[PDB]
Design a protein around this ligand. Structure first.
Ligand code: NAG
Ligand code: NAG
Lengths: 50, 56
């Protein structure tokens, strides 16, 4: 079933108590945090002796 | 507890497991914030029952 990714994550927030207004008012902040985490994943997998 | 769909000329609200069109009232929606911070806003009307049923 096709569904927009913002609305998908908004419906994924209604599983832990958080409503959709949070995601719909801080969509840019959530996107920036997700991109920063994805970017830091490679940096923290770079050396990682274990 | 639904999703806003539109058959081309009128918007409705349906549960996301089965198509059941219902009018957008003040019972299946909650107000939070203004129409500037949200990205993807659409102009429409929210039919409330109070004002119609008050007319007598
Ligand atoms: C959409 O649904 C409304 C129901 O009120 C109906 O009046 C209208 O003709 C429908 N339009 C289309 C394109 O199906
Ligand atoms: C909705 O209405 C406001 C003012 O009535 C207008 O500024 C805005 O552009 C409208 N948006 C759409 C999508 O029609």
């Amino acid at each position: 079933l096709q569904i927009p990714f913002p609305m998908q994550m908004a419906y994924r927030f209604n599983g832990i108590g958080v409503t959709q207004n949070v995601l719909y008012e801080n969509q840019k902040l959530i996107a920036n945090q997700f991109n920063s985490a994805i970017g830091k994943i490679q940096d923290s997998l770079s050396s990682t002796p274990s | 507890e639904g999703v806003f769909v539109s058959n081309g000329t009128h918007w409705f609200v349906t549960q996301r497991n089965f198509y059941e069109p219902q009018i957008i009232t003040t019972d299946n929606t909650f107000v939070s914030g203004n129409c500037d911070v949200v990205i993807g806003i659409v102009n429409n009307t929210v039919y409330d029952p109070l004002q119609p049923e008050l007319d007598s």
